[PDB]
Amino acid sequence: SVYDAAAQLTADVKKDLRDSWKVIGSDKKGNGVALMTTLFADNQETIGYFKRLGDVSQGMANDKLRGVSITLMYALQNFIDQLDNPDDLVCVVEKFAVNHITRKISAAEFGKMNGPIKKVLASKNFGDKYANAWAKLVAVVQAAL
Amino acid sequence: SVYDAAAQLTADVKKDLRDSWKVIGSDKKGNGVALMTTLFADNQETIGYFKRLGDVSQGMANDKLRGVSITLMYALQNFIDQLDNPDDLVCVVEKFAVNHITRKISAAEFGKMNGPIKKVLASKNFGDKYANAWAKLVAVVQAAL
Numbered sequence: 001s002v003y004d005a006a007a008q009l010t011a012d013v014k015k016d017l018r019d020s021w022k023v024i025g026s027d028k029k030g031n032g033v034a035l036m037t038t039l040f041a042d043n044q045e046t047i048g049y050f051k052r053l054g055d056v057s058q059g060m061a062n063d064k065l066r067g068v069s070i071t072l073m074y075a076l077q078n079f080i081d082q083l084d085n086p087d088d089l090v091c092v093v094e095k096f097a098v099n100h101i102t103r104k105i106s107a108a109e110f111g112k113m114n115g116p117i118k119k120v121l122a123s124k125n126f127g128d129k130y131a132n133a134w135a136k137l138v139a140v141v142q143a144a145l
Numbered sequence: 146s147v148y149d150a151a152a153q154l155t156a157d158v159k160k161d162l163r164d165s166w167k168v169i170g171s172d173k174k175g176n177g178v179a180l181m182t183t184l185f186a187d188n189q190e191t192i193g194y195f196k197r198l199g200d201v202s203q204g205m206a207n208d209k210l211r212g213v214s215i216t217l218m219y220a221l222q223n224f225i226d227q228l229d230n231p232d233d234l235v236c237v238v239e240k241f242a243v244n245h246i247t248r249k250i251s252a253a254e255f256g257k258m259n260g261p262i263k264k265v266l267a268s269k270n271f272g273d274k275y276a277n278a279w280a281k282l283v284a285v286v287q288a289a290l
């Protein structure tokens with residue numbers, strides 16, 4: 001359940017989440033777009049869910065893609081800020097799950113973002129330790145899908 | 146049209162938005178719920194759009210309501226952060242408009258949030274000058290609806 005998943009966010013996991021976000025969240029536009037372009041490059045199959053965005057290969061030049069990219073980063077910002085209170089984290093995660101469920105995005109599909117996060121993290125000198133911390137956070141959302 | 150509305154966001158207006166947000170945005174859960182509950186108190190009809198939240202009368206205690214309220218505040222956080230780059234503000238605004246358009250929320254309906262904002266700002270001692278600044282921000286989103 002989503003409540004058991006949130007419980008997996010131990011003290012050190014939270015610290016690693018915050019330490020890496022401090023760097024990653026510094027450039028929401030740049031890193032957000034990097035996240036999305038990497039998702040589409042490594043998982044071409046997911047592009048079909050983003051028809052509304054148009055030519056996703058345009059990257060930063062695509063206004064709609066940039067809109068979603070920036071907004072996605074503020075969702076991660078939201079999760080990080082809620083790490084202190086599990087009750088606030090869960091209600092925020094559930095709200096986000098709802099919008100994805102409507103788009104028929106499954107937990108397995110949603111988890112595909114772990115690859116991109118791992119890559120952007122590594123580009124900034126954050127290794128497996130951090131990628132795993134982030135996978136734990138994503139898992140909380142997966143538990144709600 | 147959206148770009149034209151963004152043009153109303155002058156140097157002084159942006160300055161008031163940023164200064165008032167420094168306080169209002171410091172307690173997203175508290176001020177977010179204050180906004181939603183006020184909207185529902187002054188415009189009871191708007192509740193028809195939020196059937197999914199269940200018993201909104203529980204206010205802060207309602208997890209679904211709390212979830213939407215906190216998330217609402219990060220949308221505003223997003224807008225505030227994009228004030229200095231019209232191209233980014235616009236793409237982010239249009240993204241957020243899309244979701245409301247889908248729910249059949251007209252520009253007139255959207256403008257009802259202006260009252261709650263004015264009251265919330267006033268509770269923190271930010272008068273008409275600031276309320277007016279915020280009305281202009283909301284007007285940018287209305288331009289996209």
Ligand code: HEM
Pocket residue numbers: 046049050052053068071072075076099100103105109110111112113138240244
């Ligand atoms: C941890 C990773 C993810 C986060 C935090 C996230 C966050 C977001 C946010 C905040 C939005 C914008 C608001 C909205 O329209 O609901 C959004 C939209 C969307 N997301 Fe995600 N998402 C994630 C992963 C994914 C994945 C892996 C897929 C699909 C394989 C997906 C599919 C969608 C779709 C289809 C949209 C609609 C885009 C549009 O047309 O505007 N998301 N996501």
Ligand code: HEM
Pocket residue numbers: 095099191194195197198213216217218220221244245248250254255256257258283
């Ligand atoms: C300052 C103005 C407002 C902002 C910044 C805002 C922001 C948001 C955000 C960020 C969400 C969550 C993401 C999503 O699901 O789209 C949302 C959802 C929603 N908004 Fe607003 N909103 C505003 C005004 C309004 C008004 C006045 C109405 C209607 C009278 C409205 C109706 C809705 C509805 C029905 C939802 C879906 C809630 C749910 O079931 O999760 N919004 N809004």
